[PDB]
């Protein structure tokens, strides 16, 4: 038995311890703002991929593009740019109606193509405005 007897004989948790202490996409967000004079923020309606394409393609025929970026990487430039009131708007899935001409009324008309999709606002002719204001300017 002594053989077994010999065999048996022969401070702060790192948990509580305090823990020791996009660039390409940044250009893309800058590029759309530089290239497109007006950026209209509309909620992404989770449209079908085939239906999403034709709307983008149909706008492409009208030389109008659709641009989408993640919100969290979009916060910095929106904080310091000509467009600063879109930060609360850019929550969740979103899309941008971006063009070269102030076709605000036609933008709603293309938006009216799918009635369920609403418009939240944005900027037209580099002027940031809400939808209620945009409708007045559209007239």
């Amino acid at each position: 038995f002594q053989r077994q007897k010999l065999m048996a004989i022969t401070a702060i948790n790192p948990r509580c311890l305090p823990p020791p202490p996009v660039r390409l996409l940044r250009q893309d967000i800058v590029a759309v703002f530089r290239d497109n004079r007006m950026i209209a923020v509309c909620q992404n309606v989770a449209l079908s991929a085939e239906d999403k394409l034709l709307l983008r393609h149909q706008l492409r025929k009208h030389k109008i593009f659709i641009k989408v970026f993640p919100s969290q990487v979009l916060k910095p430039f929106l904080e310091n740019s000509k467009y600063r009131n879109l930060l609360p708007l850019f929550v969740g899935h979103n899309l941008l109606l971006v063009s070269e001409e102030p076709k605000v009324k036609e933008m709603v008309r293309v938006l009216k193509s799918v009635p369920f999709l609403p418009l939240l606002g944005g900027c037209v002719d580099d002027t940031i405005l809400s939808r209620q204001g945009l409708v007045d300017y559209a007239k």
Binding site: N13, R15, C16, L17, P18, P19
Partner: protein, 157 residues
């Protein structure tokens, strides 16, 4: 605290919630338990401590909301089960769906209960002194708790 009031019109209204006691003894404690220097000093009978993490009907709160670290999210959960089975939380009984009455059988007093009483089979063959089978008492998750005895606590009785 946001709660729903029904009238049909139903409205959820945010109400003021009790605020946590300031100035924890241990500053910068990563886990709420350690913040208060209760890392290895609480047991099942500490109803006051455990009650701070339990739903009104006896359910456990999610880790995120509570903020406890997983190590203390399992130990706290384990102690809560022992407290319920020992009748230390009489005001957090299950919600009776349709006014159903309790089983009406008298409740046997139990404490330090590791497993559910329904899921434990009797040990008909006890075993001899050398081979004797042990009956579980307490839970292994509380091994690190401070011991004020000469020798370590006997989990298996």
């Amino acid at each position: 605290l946001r709660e729903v009031v029904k009238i049909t019109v139903i409205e959820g209204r945010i109400t003021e919630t009790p605020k946590a006691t300031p100035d924890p003894p241990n500053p910068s404690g990563q886990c709420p338990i350690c913040r208060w220097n209760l890392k290895h000093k609480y047991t099942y009978e500490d109803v006051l401590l455990l009650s701070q993490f339990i739903r009104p009907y006896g359910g456990m709160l999610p880790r995120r909301v509570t903020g406890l670290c997983r190590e203390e999210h399992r130990k706290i959960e384990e102690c809560v089960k022992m407290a319920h089975r020992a009748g230390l939380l009489p005001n957090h009984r299950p919600q009776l769906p349709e006014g159903c009455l309790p089983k009406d059988k008298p409740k046997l007093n139990r404490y330090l209960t590791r497993w559910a009483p329904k899921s434990v089979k009797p040990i008909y063959k006890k075993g001899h002194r050398w081979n004797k089978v042990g009956m579980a008492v307490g839970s292994p998750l509380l091994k690190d708790n401070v011991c004020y005895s000469r020798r370590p606590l006997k989990m298996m009785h």
